[PDB]
């Protein structure tokens, strides 16, 4: 409703670096807000794409940002009669970033890893890896829970059980208030997908450079399965957290599995022990129901509600025809211990191939009316197909079925304007929460400032 579309702020990164693929707000020890941006195709030391992270200070004019430097050198360790190897080439560092406290977490989902023992090997596979940084102290650390030293032969003998060689840990990342990092690894367990969790504090204290294979006792990974419904479901394609059981001591996880059950798609709500509480199934095959998930209380009943994106959902139209436009599903949490019912609201895209529902960002209370609002992205939507972001306001009855505002892309075609969103943070400290919109296609980030309501 009251985001300022006239006077935006632009941050830009290196050409072809996909600067803006992922972003997030970041407060230092003093509460000073800065933007953290991921550029997964930024050139490394050998003029080869390794990815990179940028930490942008708030500035009404924006501009260029300094790099949050990480180690980008491939590592080797000859230990226990084995050879451990990390391969960072085309790893996609910054394919996802999240900030918690004064710590930043940037993940390279396609960082490869291999082990050699004589004439055998584990296989060179994308286990992924996360890089943790504390900008103020200069502290650094890593977390790569899917690394292993089992040889190829073993997996074959065991019928490829608990095979975590393709996890791509960090595909999606979230952090609980308590400070537990939760990584979505859609490739884990031979493409079933898995979740890995570990306390940030413990990740730091247990890490040392050069070791490559170390233990994090407090870590917790989800489980494998023999059920074909889970096969190639990419469990952990997207992740989120919230409160969905009434017990405020426990934190619940929300996992998207966009191709679950033969591309039907689904999203499940679990406890910290990966026990399923609810499961919402897709409405249509290949719609990619679960591509994105958001958690926030939109009707002001104190209970977190769920939002699910299906960016490829095809809408039924005249003469028995279907039009790929995308869709968002709202699920309101019922009072007390009850199952989430049918969707309370179905928001559907308008532009063909617009991919409405590709991203969904909680804005907090944008207009300050007492109900939380959200933003929904259609990266290839708008009459010009350049990208569009639609704001929907909260209300006692959930959400408004029509958008309160529509942000058209300030960039040129192909920018993927809206592929990443982040809100609910007041970056200019004017009392109103703001929105940052990434357009990796254009290697830029647009900042929208919320202003006092005009009407």
């Amino acid at each position, epitope marked *: 409703l009251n985001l300022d579309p006239v006077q935006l702020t632009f941050y830009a990164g290196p050409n072809g670096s996909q600067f803006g693929f992922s972003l997030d707000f970041h407060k230092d020890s003093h509460g000073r807000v800065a933007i953290v941006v991921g550029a997964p195709r930024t050139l490394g030391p050998s003029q080869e794409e390794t990815g990179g992270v940028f930490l942008c200070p708030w500035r009404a004019e924006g501009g260029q940002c300094p790099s949050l430097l990480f180690d980008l050198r491939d590592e080797t*360790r*000859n*230990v*226990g*009669s084995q050879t451990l190897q990390t391969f960072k080439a085309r790893q996609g560092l910054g394919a996802s970033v999240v900030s918690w406290s004064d710590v930043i977490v940037a993940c390279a989902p396609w960082q490869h890893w291999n082990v050699l023992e004589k004439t055998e090997e584990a296989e060179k596979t994308p286990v992924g890896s996360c890089f943790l940084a504390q900008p103020e102290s200069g502290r650094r650390a890593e977390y790569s829970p899917c690394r292993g*030293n089992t040889l190829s032969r073993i997996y074959v003998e065991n019928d490829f059980s608990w095979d975590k060689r393709y996890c791509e840990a960090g595909f999606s990342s979230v952090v609980t208030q308590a400070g537990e990092l939760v990584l979505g690894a859609p490739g884990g367990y031979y493409f079933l997908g898995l979740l890995a969790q570990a306390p940030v504090a413990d990740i730091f204290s*247990s*890490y*040392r450079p*050069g*070791i490559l*294979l*170390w*233990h*994090v*006792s407090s870590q917790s990974l989800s489980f494998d399965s023999s059920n074909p419904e889970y096969f190639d479901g990419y469990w952990g394609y997207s992740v989120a957290v919230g409160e969905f059981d009434g017990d405020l001591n426990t934190t619940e996880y929300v996992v998207g599995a966009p191709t679950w059950s033969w591309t039907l798609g689904a999203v499940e709500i679990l406890d910290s022990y990966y026990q399923r509480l609810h499961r919402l199934r897709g409405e249509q095959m290949a719609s990619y129901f679960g591509h994105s998930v958001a958690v926030t209380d939109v009707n002001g009943d104190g209970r977190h509600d769920l939002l699910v994106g299906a960016p490829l959902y095809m809408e039924s139209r005249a003469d028995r025809k279907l039009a790929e436009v995308g869709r968002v599903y709202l699920f309101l949490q019922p009072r007390g211990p009850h199952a989430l019912g049918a969707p309370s609201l179905l928001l559907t895209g308008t532009q063909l191939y617009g991919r409405f529902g590709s991203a969904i960002a909680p804005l907090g209370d944008l207009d300050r009316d007492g109900y939380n609002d959200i933003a929904v992205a259609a990266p290839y939507g708008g009459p010009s197909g350049r990208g569009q972001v639609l704001v929907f306001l909260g209300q006692s009855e959930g959400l408004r079925s029509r958008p309160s505002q529509v942000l058209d892309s300030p960039f040129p075609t192909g920018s993927a304007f809206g592929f990443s969103l982040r809100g609910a943070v007041d970056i200019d400290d004017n009392g109103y929460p703001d929105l940052i919109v990434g357009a990796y296609g254009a290697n830029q980030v647009a900042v929208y400032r919320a202003q006092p309501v005009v009407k």
Partner: antibody
Amino acid sequence: EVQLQQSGAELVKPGASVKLSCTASGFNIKDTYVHWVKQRPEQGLEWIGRIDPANGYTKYDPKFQGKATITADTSSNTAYLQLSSLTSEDTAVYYCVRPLYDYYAMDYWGQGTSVTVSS
Amino acid sequence: DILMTQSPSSMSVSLGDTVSITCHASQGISSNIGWLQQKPGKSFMGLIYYGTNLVDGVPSRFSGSGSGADYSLTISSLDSEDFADYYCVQYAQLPYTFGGGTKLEIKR
């Protein structure tokens, strides 16, 4: 806290077979590797072998191959070391070990198990 | 098997001293070494792992160093408990192998 409670002192006759145990406290044995080490006054320390209690795979120093047998039961959260055809040279103190962070390290040690082979 | 030549076998020193133990290998082991401590009539305690990294709980007066086939454990300002047996172990290759050991004794 990580603690490895090894079995009590054992006293057996030559030719017999003893089975030492190493129960884990404050953690799940299945977590890391579990090595067994032999110590003697003059001969000093010697690595026997190790086991991954998760999958049950073992590695031995070719010196002990045949004499030593390492196993682990995740149920009782305990790892074992069985020695057969005992002799006087087998008289030694045995330690079960596991790493702290580094997968291949030797950081945490059990209190030890005294073994004496005599008639 | 990799041999671990640890020296000296023993040394008589007083408190507050800064002594250093050394460990040579029959071949390189890329800082894949660990230092152990065994107080008289007691079990073992991990001091260092991967060359230089202190095991949680170990005093900072301890420090591991070196590279290749030669490494050294150093104790700055000896304490009354520091008088004990110390061993080095390599886990660069299987089987793991230990050093001869070094006994710190009180001088007089």
